[PDB]
Ligand binder design. Structure first.
Ligand SMILES: *C(=O)N1C[C@H](NOS(=O)(=O)O)CC[C@H]1C(=O)NC1CCNCC1
Length: 361
């Protein structure tokens, strides 16, 4: 009855949304009572007929920020940086710029003062162009006052955490972070030998779409991973104490809330809500205006533990993909939903919420 019931519940949550959004392929992984459960739907590639499995690689877009946060959490534990450091402390090129007056925490939590959603199209994947971009940038408003969701913001945070560790960001993820987390199906640059696992992404008129190079891509949106590996990452988040101390502490650092905007508490990478909360409120927290518009923050008196009866989540998209991850620390429950179409966040959250509410019922 239990396996039948879980299958029935996940099918009932996924299938209508998959169909309504014409999603070619979709992978679900659920961590429940200390055990993983995988559900795979449809096609990784419509053209060659490869089916989705729990090992299929999907682009996870902005979910990458949680890995980026974990690297920064590590740097914090290596006493290599502090959240209250000025950004320019970690890149001499920034000394004398406005980044003298902006903290690593401001950068990590999108409150640096109006850094935009993306780098302008004129900024290529080029260290000098990136450096020059930040040198010339001026805040629209005071640092620490307004949240404006931003790839350049947390991208810089990740880049400076890597600088504090004395190695390139990409090398650190591949050589240290992913191995420390036990992740062998998680990549910034998918190896040729693994390309057969990499799903095709689909956009309008089913044009094929995979993510191309961009400035600070690895930091903001560049990770490709499987449902099985992303769930392993969720289980690491549920049980940091199962890893060696330095990496336990790194994960813990991403479970700390610094301010609220409406129902959402902003951590490093992770965004948190009280649990339970209505589907409509969770949808609103992950809505377009939350990503695209500035919001005045309500700063907490002290960092808040993001644990117990809370839902921690992150959405992520690329041109061709749509990912969502959610977990409830106090219930030892986690879920991953990866699709090879960018479909609205509200729809991803709807699937997740249907699964979570069915599990409690
Ligand atoms: C994350 O997936 N990003 C950044 C931002 N996230 O807002 S959210 O509510 O979707 O998580 C916007 C979309 C996405 C992003 O950076 N997409 C880019 C499209 C163009 N190619 C580079 C990735």
């Amino acid at each position: 009855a239990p396996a039948d019931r879980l299958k029935a519940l996940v099918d009932a949550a996924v299938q209508p949304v998959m169909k309504a959004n014409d999603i070619p392929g979709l992978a679900v992984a659920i961590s429940l009572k200390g055990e993983p459960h995988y559900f795979s739907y449809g096609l990784a590639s419509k053209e060659d007929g490869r089916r989705v499995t729990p090992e299929t690689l999907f682009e996870i877009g902005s979910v990458s920020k949680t890995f980026t946060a974990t690297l920064a959490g590590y740097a914090l534990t290596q006493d290599k940086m502090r959240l209250d450091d000025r950004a320019s402390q970690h890149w001499p090129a920034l000394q004398g710029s406005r980044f003298d007056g902006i903290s690593l925490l401001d950068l990590a939590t999108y409150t640096a003062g109006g850094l935009p959603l993306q780098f302008p199209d004129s900024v290529q994947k080029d260290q000098a162009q990136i450096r020059d971009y930040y040198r010339q940038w001026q805040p629209t408003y005071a640092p620490g006052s307004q949240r404006l969701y931003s790839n350049p913001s947390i991208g810089l945070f990740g880049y400076l955490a890597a600088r504090s560790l004395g190695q390139p960001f990409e090398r650190l993820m591949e050589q240290q972070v992913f191995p420390a987390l036990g992740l062998e199906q998680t990549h910034l640059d998918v190896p040729e030998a693994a390309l057969a696992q990499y799903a095709q992404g689909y956009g309008k008129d089913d044009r094929p779409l995979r993510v191309g190079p961009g400035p600070l891509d690895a930091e903001g949106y560049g990770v490709k991973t499987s449902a099985a590996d992303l769930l392993r990452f969720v289980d690491a988040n549920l049980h940091p104490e199962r890893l060696d101390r330095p990496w336990a502490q790194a994960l813990d650092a991403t479970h700390r809330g610094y301010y609220k905007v409406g129902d959402m508490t902003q951590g490093l990478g992770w965004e948190a809500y009280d649990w339970p909360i209505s589907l409509k409120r969770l949808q609103a927290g992950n809505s377009t205006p939350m990503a695209l518009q500035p919001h005045r923050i309500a700063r907490l008196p002290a960092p808040q533990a993001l644990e117990g009866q809370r839902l921690l989540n992150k959405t992520g998209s690329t041109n061709g993909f749509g990912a969502y991850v959610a977990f409830v620390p106090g219930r030892d429950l986690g879920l991953v939903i990866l699709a090879n179409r960018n479909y609205p966040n509200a729809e991803r959250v709807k699937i997740a919420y249907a699964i979570l509410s069915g599990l409690e019922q």
